[PDB]
Amino acid sequence: GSSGSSGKKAKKVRFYRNGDRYFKGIVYAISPDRFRSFEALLADLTRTLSDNVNLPQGVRTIYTIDGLKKISSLDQLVEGESYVCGSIEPFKKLEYTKNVNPNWSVNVKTSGPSSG
């Protein structure tokens, strides 16, 4: 394999709340037959990540976990990565992986209702 092609089966991306470490976060699968444009991704993100205490207006700017680059389109994200949903407040450096660890986009050890 001389090209570097991981795949294109829905880009797994985790979105957290800007200024909230307690939050576990919400996963997202960017698939061709799921999200038409960025407007669709913003609508869904606002449906979940949007409250009076955190992001009153909603979601618009989604930065990375490190806080170096900013996502604008759907062809910018990467398979198996994390991003922070921002709006007005400035980016905050917090340890999210500390309470999550990289083990969701490699070994599915949870579906949803399963607990115990």
Short mmCIF file of N, CA, C and O in Angstrom, two decimals:
data_model
loop_
_atom_site.label_atom_id
_atom_site.label_comp_id
_atom_site.label_asym_id
_atom_site.label_seq_id
_atom_site.Cartn_x
_atom_site.Cartn_y
_atom_site.Cartn_z
N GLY A 1 0.83 -1.24 0.00
CA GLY A 1 0.00 0.00 0.00
C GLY A 1 0.84 1.26 0.00
O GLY A 1 1.40 1.64 1.03
N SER A 2 0.94 1.91 -1.16
CA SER A 2 1.72 3.13 -1.29
C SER A 2 0.82 4.31 -1.64
O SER A 2 0.68 4.68 -2.80
N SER A 3 0.21 4.91 -0.61
CA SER A 3 -0.67 6.05 -0.81
C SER A 3 -1.14 6.62 0.53
O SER A 3 -1.18 7.83 0.72
N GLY A 4 -1.48 5.72 1.45
CA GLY A 4 -1.94 6.15 2.76
C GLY A 4 -3.44 6.38 2.80
O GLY A 4 -3.89 7.52 2.91
N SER A 5 -4.21 5.30 2.72
CA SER A 5 -5.66 5.39 2.75
C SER A 5 -6.23 4.59 3.92
O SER A 5 -6.31 3.36 3.86
N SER A 6 -6.62 5.29 4.98
CA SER A 6 -7.18 4.64 6.16
C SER A 6 -8.58 4.11 5.88
O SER A 6 -8.94 3.01 6.31
N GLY A 7 -9.37 4.89 5.15
CA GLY A 7 -10.73 4.48 4.82
C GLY A 7 -11.66 5.66 4.64
O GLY A 7 -11.23 6.81 4.62
N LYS A 8 -12.95 5.37 4.51
CA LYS A 8 -13.96 6.41 4.33
C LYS A 8 -15.32 5.96 4.85
O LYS A 8 -16.36 6.45 4.41
N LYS A 9 -15.30 5.03 5.80
CA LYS A 9 -16.54 4.51 6.38
C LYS A 9 -16.93 5.32 7.61
O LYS A 9 -16.74 4.89 8.75
N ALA A 10 -17.49 6.51 7.38
CA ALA A 10 -17.92 7.38 8.47
C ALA A 10 -16.73 7.78 9.34
O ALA A 10 -16.12 6.94 10.00
N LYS A 11 -16.42 9.07 9.35
CA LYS A 11 -15.31 9.59 10.15
C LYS A 11 -15.72 9.76 11.61
O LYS A 11 -16.52 10.64 11.94
N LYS A 12 -15.18 8.91 12.47
CA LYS A 12 -15.49 8.97 13.90
C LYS A 12 -14.85 10.19 14.54
O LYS A 12 -13.63 10.35 14.51
N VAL A 13 -15.67 11.04 15.14
CA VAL A 13 -15.19 12.25 15.79
C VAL A 13 -15.95 12.52 17.08
O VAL A 13 -17.18 12.45 17.11
N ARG A 14 -15.22 12.83 18.15
CA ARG A 14 -15.83 13.11 19.44
C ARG A 14 -15.87 14.61 19.71
O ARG A 14 -14.86 15.31 19.57
N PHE A 15 -17.04 15.11 20.09
CA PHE A 15 -17.21 16.53 20.37
C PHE A 15 -17.47 16.76 21.86
O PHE A 15 -18.36 16.14 22.44
N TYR A 16 -16.70 17.65 22.46
CA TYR A 16 -16.85 17.96 23.88
C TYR A 16 -17.38 19.38 24.07
O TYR A 16 -17.57 20.12 23.11
N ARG A 17 -17.62 19.75 25.33
CA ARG A 17 -18.14 21.08 25.65
C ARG A 17 -17.01 22.01 26.07
O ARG A 17 -16.24 21.69 26.98
N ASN A 18 -16.91 23.16 25.41
CA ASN A 18 -15.87 24.13 25.72
C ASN A 18 -15.99 24.61 27.16
O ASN A 18 -16.88 25.39 27.50
N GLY A 19 -15.08 24.13 28.01
CA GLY A 19 -15.10 24.52 29.41
C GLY A 19 -15.87 23.54 30.27
O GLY A 19 -16.61 23.94 31.17
N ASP A 20 -15.68 22.25 30.00
CA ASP A 20 -16.36 21.21 30.76
C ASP A 20 -15.60 19.88 30.67
O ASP A 20 -15.64 19.21 29.64
N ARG A 21 -14.92 19.52 31.75
CA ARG A 21 -14.16 18.28 31.79
C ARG A 21 -15.02 17.12 32.27
O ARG A 21 -14.82 15.97 31.88
N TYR A 22 -16.00 17.43 33.12
CA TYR A 22 -16.89 16.41 33.66
C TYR A 22 -17.66 15.72 32.54
O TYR A 22 -17.94 14.52 32.61
N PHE A 23 -17.99 16.48 31.49
CA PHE A 23 -18.72 15.93 30.36
C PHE A 23 -17.93 14.82 29.68
O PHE A 23 -16.74 14.98 29.40
N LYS A 24 -18.59 13.70 29.41
CA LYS A 24 -17.94 12.57 28.77
C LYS A 24 -17.74 12.83 27.28
O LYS A 24 -16.79 12.34 26.67
N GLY A 25 -18.66 13.59 26.69
CA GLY A 25 -18.57 13.90 25.28
C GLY A 25 -19.52 13.08 24.44
O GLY A 25 -20.12 12.12 24.93
N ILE A 26 -19.68 13.46 23.17
CA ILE A 26 -20.57 12.74 22.27
C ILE A 26 -19.86 12.39 20.96
O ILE A 26 -19.26 13.25 20.32
N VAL A 27 -19.94 11.12 20.58
CA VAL A 27 -19.31 10.66 19.35
C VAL A 27 -20.11 11.07 18.12
O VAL A 27 -21.31 11.33 18.22
N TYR A 28 -19.45 11.11 16.97
CA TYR A 28 -20.11 11.49 15.73
C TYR A 28 -19.46 10.79 14.54
O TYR A 28 -18.24 10.77 14.41
N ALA A 29 -20.29 10.22 13.67
CA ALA A 29 -19.80 9.52 12.49
C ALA A 29 -20.13 10.29 11.22
O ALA A 29 -21.28 10.28 10.76
N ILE A 30 -19.13 10.94 10.64
CA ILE A 30 -19.32 11.72 9.42
C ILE A 30 -19.30 10.81 8.19
O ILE A 30 -18.23 10.48 7.67
N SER A 31 -20.48 10.42 7.73
CA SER A 31 -20.60 9.56 6.56
C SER A 31 -21.23 10.31 5.39
O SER A 31 -22.04 11.21 5.59
N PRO A 32 -20.86 9.95 4.15
CA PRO A 32 -21.40 10.60 2.95
C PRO A 32 -22.92 10.59 2.92
O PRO A 32 -23.55 11.57 2.50
N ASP A 33 -23.51 9.49 3.37
CA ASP A 33 -24.96 9.36 3.40
C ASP A 33 -25.51 9.69 4.79
O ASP A 33 -26.43 9.03 5.27
N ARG A 34 -24.95 10.72 5.41
CA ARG A 34 -25.38 11.13 6.74
C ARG A 34 -25.41 12.65 6.85
O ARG A 34 -26.43 13.24 7.22
N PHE A 35 -24.28 13.29 6.54
CA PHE A 35 -24.18 14.74 6.60
C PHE A 35 -23.93 15.33 5.22
O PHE A 35 -22.87 15.13 4.63
N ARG A 36 -24.92 16.05 4.70
CA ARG A 36 -24.81 16.67 3.39
C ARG A 36 -23.80 17.82 3.41
O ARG A 36 -22.81 17.80 2.68
N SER A 37 -24.07 18.82 4.24
CA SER A 37 -23.19 19.97 4.36
C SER A 37 -22.88 20.28 5.82
O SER A 37 -23.32 19.56 6.72
N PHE A 38 -22.12 21.34 6.05
CA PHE A 38 -21.75 21.74 7.40
C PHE A 38 -22.97 22.19 8.19
O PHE A 38 -23.03 22.04 9.41
N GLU A 39 -23.95 22.75 7.49
CA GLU A 39 -25.18 23.22 8.12
C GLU A 39 -25.88 22.09 8.85
O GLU A 39 -26.49 22.30 9.90
N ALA A 40 -25.80 20.88 8.29
CA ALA A 40 -26.43 19.72 8.89
C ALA A 40 -25.71 19.29 10.16
O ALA A 40 -26.33 18.82 11.11
N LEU A 41 -24.39 19.45 10.16
CA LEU A 41 -23.57 19.07 11.31
C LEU A 41 -23.77 20.06 12.46
O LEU A 41 -23.71 19.69 13.63
N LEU A 42 -24.02 21.32 12.12
CA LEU A 42 -24.23 22.36 13.12
C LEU A 42 -25.59 22.21 13.78
O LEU A 42 -25.75 22.48 14.97
N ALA A 43 -26.58 21.77 13.00
CA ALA A 43 -27.93 21.58 13.52
C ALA A 43 -27.98 20.45 14.54
O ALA A 43 -28.60 20.58 15.60
N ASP A 44 -27.31 19.35 14.23
CA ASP A 44 -27.27 18.20 15.13
C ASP A 44 -26.48 18.52 16.39
O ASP A 44 -26.89 18.19 17.50
N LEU A 45 -25.33 19.17 16.21
CA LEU A 45 -24.47 19.53 17.34
C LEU A 45 -25.21 20.45 18.31
O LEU A 45 -25.05 20.35 19.52
N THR A 46 -26.02 21.35 17.76
CA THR A 46 -26.79 22.29 18.57
C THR A 46 -27.92 21.58 19.31
O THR A 46 -28.30 21.97 20.41
N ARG A 47 -28.45 20.53 18.68
CA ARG A 47 -29.54 19.76 19.28
C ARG A 47 -29.09 19.07 20.56
O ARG A 47 -29.89 18.86 21.47
N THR A 48 -27.81 18.73 20.62
CA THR A 48 -27.25 18.07 21.80
C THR A 48 -26.39 19.03 22.61
O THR A 48 -26.68 19.29 23.78
N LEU A 49 -25.35 19.56 21.99
CA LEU A 49 -24.45 20.49 22.66
C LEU A 49 -24.94 21.93 22.51
O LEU A 49 -24.53 22.64 21.59
N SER A 50 -25.82 22.35 23.41
CA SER A 50 -26.36 23.70 23.38
C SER A 50 -27.27 23.95 24.58
O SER A 50 -28.34 23.35 24.69
N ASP A 51 -26.85 24.84 25.46
CA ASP A 51 -27.63 25.17 26.65
C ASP A 51 -27.34 26.60 27.11
O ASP A 51 -26.42 27.25 26.62
N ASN A 52 -28.14 27.08 28.06
CA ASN A 52 -27.98 28.43 28.58
C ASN A 52 -26.67 28.56 29.36
O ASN A 52 -26.06 29.62 29.40
N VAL A 53 -26.25 27.46 29.98
CA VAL A 53 -25.01 27.45 30.75
C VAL A 53 -23.80 27.27 29.85
O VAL A 53 -22.72 27.80 30.13
N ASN A 54 -23.97 26.51 28.77
CA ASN A 54 -22.89 26.26 27.82
C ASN A 54 -23.37 26.45 26.39
O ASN A 54 -24.20 25.70 25.89
N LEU A 55 -22.83 27.47 25.72
CA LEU A 55 -23.20 27.76 24.34
C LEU A 55 -24.70 28.05 24.23
O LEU A 55 -25.48 27.17 23.86
N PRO A 56 -25.11 29.29 24.54
CA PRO A 56 -26.52 29.69 24.47
C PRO A 56 -27.02 29.80 23.03
O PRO A 56 -28.15 29.41 22.73
N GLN A 57 -26.18 30.33 22.15
CA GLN A 57 -26.53 30.49 20.75
C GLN A 57 -26.47 29.15 20.02
O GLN A 57 -27.29 28.86 19.15
N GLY A 58 -25.47 28.34 20.37
CA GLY A 58 -25.31 27.05 19.73
C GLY A 58 -23.87 26.74 19.38
O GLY A 58 -22.95 27.11 20.12
N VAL A 59 -23.66 26.07 18.25
CA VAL A 59 -22.32 25.72 17.81
C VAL A 59 -22.01 26.34 16.45
O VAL A 59 -22.88 26.42 15.58
N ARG A 60 -20.77 26.79 16.28
CA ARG A 60 -20.35 27.41 15.03
C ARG A 60 -18.89 27.08 14.72
O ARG A 60 -18.56 26.68 13.61
N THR A 61 -18.03 27.25 15.72
CA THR A 61 -16.61 26.97 15.56
C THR A 61 -16.19 25.77 16.40
O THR A 61 -16.31 25.79 17.62
N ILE A 62 -15.70 24.73 15.74
CA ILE A 62 -15.26 23.52 16.42
C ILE A 62 -13.75 23.33 16.30
O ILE A 62 -13.26 22.91 15.26
N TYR A 63 -13.04 23.64 17.37
CA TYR A 63 -11.58 23.50 17.39
C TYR A 63 -11.17 22.08 17.74
O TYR A 63 -12.01 21.25 18.11
N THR A 64 -9.88 21.80 17.62
CA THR A 64 -9.36 20.47 17.93
C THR A 64 -9.14 20.30 19.43
O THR A 64 -9.38 21.23 20.21
N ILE A 65 -8.68 19.12 19.83
CA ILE A 65 -8.44 18.84 21.24
C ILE A 65 -7.21 19.59 21.75
O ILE A 65 -7.17 20.03 22.89
N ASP A 66 -6.21 19.74 20.88
CA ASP A 66 -4.98 20.44 21.24
C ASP A 66 -5.19 21.95 21.18
O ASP A 66 -4.56 22.69 21.94
N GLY A 67 -6.06 22.39 20.29
CA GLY A 67 -6.33 23.81 20.16
C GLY A 67 -5.34 24.51 19.25
O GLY A 67 -4.84 25.58 19.57
N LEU A 68 -5.05 23.89 18.11
CA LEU A 68 -4.10 24.46 17.15
C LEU A 68 -4.82 24.91 15.88
O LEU A 68 -4.61 26.02 15.40
N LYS A 69 -5.68 24.04 15.35
CA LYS A 69 -6.43 24.36 14.14
C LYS A 69 -7.93 24.42 14.43
O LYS A 69 -8.37 24.06 15.52
N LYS A 70 -8.69 24.88 13.45
CA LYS A 70 -10.14 24.99 13.60
C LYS A 70 -10.86 24.35 12.42
O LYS A 70 -10.46 24.51 11.27
N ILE A 71 -11.93 23.61 12.71
CA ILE A 71 -12.71 22.94 11.68
C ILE A 71 -13.70 23.90 11.04
O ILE A 71 -14.36 24.68 11.72
N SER A 72 -13.80 23.84 9.71
CA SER A 72 -14.72 24.71 8.98
C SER A 72 -15.66 23.89 8.10
O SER A 72 -16.86 24.14 8.05
N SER A 73 -15.09 22.90 7.40
CA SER A 73 -15.88 22.04 6.52
C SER A 73 -15.90 20.60 7.04
O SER A 73 -15.36 20.31 8.10
N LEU A 74 -16.53 19.72 6.27
CA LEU A 74 -16.62 18.31 6.64
C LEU A 74 -15.41 17.52 6.14
O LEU A 74 -15.16 16.40 6.59
N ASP A 75 -14.65 18.11 5.22
CA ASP A 75 -13.47 17.46 4.66
C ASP A 75 -12.21 17.90 5.39
O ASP A 75 -11.12 17.91 4.80
N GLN A 76 -12.35 18.28 6.65
CA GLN A 76 -11.21 18.73 7.45
C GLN A 76 -10.95 17.77 8.61
O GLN A 76 -9.81 17.53 8.98
N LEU A 77 -12.03 17.23 9.18
CA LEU A 77 -11.92 16.30 10.30
C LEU A 77 -11.10 15.08 9.91
O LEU A 77 -10.75 14.89 8.74
N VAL A 78 -10.80 14.24 10.89
CA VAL A 78 -10.03 13.02 10.65
C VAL A 78 -10.66 11.82 11.34
O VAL A 78 -11.40 11.97 12.31
N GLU A 79 -10.36 10.63 10.84
CA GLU A 79 -10.90 9.40 11.41
C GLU A 79 -10.27 9.11 12.76
O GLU A 79 -9.05 8.93 12.87
N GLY A 80 -11.10 9.05 13.80
CA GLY A 80 -10.60 8.78 15.14
C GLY A 80 -9.90 9.97 15.75
O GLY A 80 -8.69 9.95 15.97
N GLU A 81 -10.66 11.03 16.02
CA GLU A 81 -10.10 12.24 16.62
C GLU A 81 -11.13 12.93 17.51
O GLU A 81 -12.31 12.56 17.52
N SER A 82 -10.68 13.93 18.26
CA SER A 82 -11.56 14.67 19.15
C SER A 82 -11.52 16.16 18.84
O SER A 82 -10.51 16.69 18.38
N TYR A 83 -12.64 16.84 19.09
CA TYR A 83 -12.73 18.27 18.83
C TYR A 83 -13.62 18.95 19.88
O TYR A 83 -14.49 18.32 20.47
N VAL A 84 -13.38 20.24 20.09
CA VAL A 84 -14.15 21.01 21.06
C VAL A 84 -15.11 21.97 20.37
O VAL A 84 -14.72 22.70 19.45
N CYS A 85 -16.36 21.97 20.80
CA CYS A 85 -17.38 22.84 20.22
C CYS A 85 -17.37 24.21 20.90
O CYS A 85 -17.64 24.33 22.09
N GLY A 86 -17.05 25.24 20.12
CA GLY A 86 -17.01 26.59 20.66
C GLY A 86 -18.10 27.48 20.09
O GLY A 86 -18.92 27.03 19.28
N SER A 87 -18.12 28.74 20.51
CA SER A 87 -19.12 29.69 20.04
C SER A 87 -18.64 31.12 20.23
O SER A 87 -18.29 31.81 19.27
N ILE A 88 -18.63 31.57 21.48
CA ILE A 88 -18.19 32.93 21.80
C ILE A 88 -16.99 32.91 22.74
O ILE A 88 -16.01 33.62 22.53
N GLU A 89 -17.07 32.09 23.78
CA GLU A 89 -15.99 31.97 24.75
C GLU A 89 -14.71 31.46 24.09
O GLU A 89 -14.77 30.69 23.13
N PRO A 90 -13.54 31.88 24.60
CA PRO A 90 -12.25 31.45 24.05
C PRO A 90 -11.94 29.99 24.35
O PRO A 90 -12.50 29.41 25.28
N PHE A 91 -11.06 29.40 23.55
CA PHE A 91 -10.68 28.00 23.73
C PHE A 91 -10.06 27.78 25.11
O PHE A 91 -9.32 28.62 25.61
N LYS A 92 -10.37 26.63 25.71
CA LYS A 92 -9.85 26.30 27.03
C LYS A 92 -9.06 24.99 26.99
O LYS A 92 -9.53 23.99 26.45
N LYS A 93 -7.86 25.01 27.56
CA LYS A 93 -7.01 23.83 27.58
C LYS A 93 -7.36 22.93 28.76
O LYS A 93 -7.02 23.24 29.91
N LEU A 94 -8.03 21.82 28.48
CA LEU A 94 -8.43 20.88 29.52
C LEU A 94 -8.09 19.45 29.11
O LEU A 94 -8.05 19.13 27.92
N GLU A 95 -7.86 18.60 30.10
CA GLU A 95 -7.53 17.20 29.85
C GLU A 95 -8.79 16.35 29.74
O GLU A 95 -9.31 15.86 30.75
N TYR A 96 -9.29 16.18 28.52
CA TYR A 96 -10.49 15.40 28.28
C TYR A 96 -10.16 13.91 28.22
O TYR A 96 -10.88 13.08 28.77
N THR A 97 -9.07 13.58 27.53
CA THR A 97 -8.64 12.19 27.39
C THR A 97 -8.36 11.56 28.76
O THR A 97 -8.45 10.35 28.92
N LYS A 98 -8.02 12.40 29.73
CA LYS A 98 -7.73 11.92 31.08
C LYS A 98 -8.91 11.14 31.65
O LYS A 98 -8.72 10.23 32.46
N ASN A 99 -10.11 11.49 31.23
CA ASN A 99 -11.32 10.82 31.71
C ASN A 99 -12.03 10.10 30.56
O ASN A 99 -13.25 9.95 30.58
N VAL A 100 -11.26 9.67 29.57
CA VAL A 100 -11.82 8.97 28.42
C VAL A 100 -10.83 7.96 27.85
O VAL A 100 -11.17 6.81 27.62
N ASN A 101 -9.60 8.41 27.64
CA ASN A 101 -8.55 7.55 27.10
C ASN A 101 -8.91 7.07 25.70
O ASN A 101 -10.07 6.82 25.40
N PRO A 102 -7.90 6.93 24.82
CA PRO A 102 -8.11 6.47 23.44
C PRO A 102 -8.41 4.97 23.37
O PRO A 102 -7.49 4.16 23.26
N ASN A 103 -9.69 4.62 23.43
CA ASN A 103 -10.10 3.22 23.36
C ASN A 103 -11.55 3.10 22.90
O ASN A 103 -12.26 2.18 23.29
N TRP A 104 -11.98 4.05 22.07
CA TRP A 104 -13.35 4.05 21.56
C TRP A 104 -13.36 3.81 20.05
O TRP A 104 -14.28 3.19 19.52
N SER A 105 -12.34 4.32 19.37
CA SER A 105 -12.24 4.17 17.92
C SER A 105 -11.25 3.06 17.56
O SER A 105 -10.59 3.11 16.52
N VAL A 106 -11.16 2.05 18.43
CA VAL A 106 -10.26 0.93 18.20
C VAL A 106 -10.86 -0.37 18.71
O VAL A 106 -10.85 -1.39 18.01
N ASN A 107 -11.40 -0.34 19.92
CA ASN A 107 -12.02 -1.51 20.52
C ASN A 107 -13.38 -1.17 21.12
O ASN A 107 -13.47 -0.67 22.24
N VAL A 108 -14.44 -1.44 20.36
CA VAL A 108 -15.80 -1.16 20.82
C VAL A 108 -16.13 -1.95 22.08
O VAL A 108 -16.46 -3.14 22.01
N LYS A 109 -16.03 -1.30 23.23
CA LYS A 109 -16.33 -1.94 24.50
C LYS A 109 -17.59 -1.35 25.14
O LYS A 109 -17.73 -1.33 26.36
N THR A 110 -18.50 -0.88 24.29
CA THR A 110 -19.75 -0.29 24.77
C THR A 110 -20.63 0.12 23.60
O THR A 110 -20.14 0.64 22.59
N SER A 111 -21.93 -0.10 23.74
CA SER A 111 -22.89 0.26 22.70
C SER A 111 -23.71 1.48 23.10
O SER A 111 -23.71 2.49 22.40
N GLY A 112 -24.40 1.37 24.23
CA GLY A 112 -25.22 2.47 24.70
C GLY A 112 -26.01 2.12 25.95
O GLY A 112 -25.69 2.58 27.04
N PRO A 113 -27.06 1.29 25.81
CA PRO A 113 -27.89 0.87 26.95
C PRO A 113 -27.16 -0.07 27.89
O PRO A 113 -27.49 -0.15 29.08
N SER A 114 -26.16 -0.77 27.37
CA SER A 114 -25.38 -1.71 28.17
C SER A 114 -24.72 -1.00 29.35
O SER A 114 -24.07 0.03 29.19
N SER A 115 -24.91 -1.56 30.54
CA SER A 115 -24.33 -0.98 31.76
C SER A 115 -24.21 -2.03 32.85
O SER A 115 -24.67 -3.16 32.70
N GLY A 116 -23.58 -1.65 33.96
CA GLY A 116 -23.41 -2.57 35.07
C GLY A 116 -22.14 -2.31 35.85
O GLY A 116 -21.19 -3.11 35.74
#
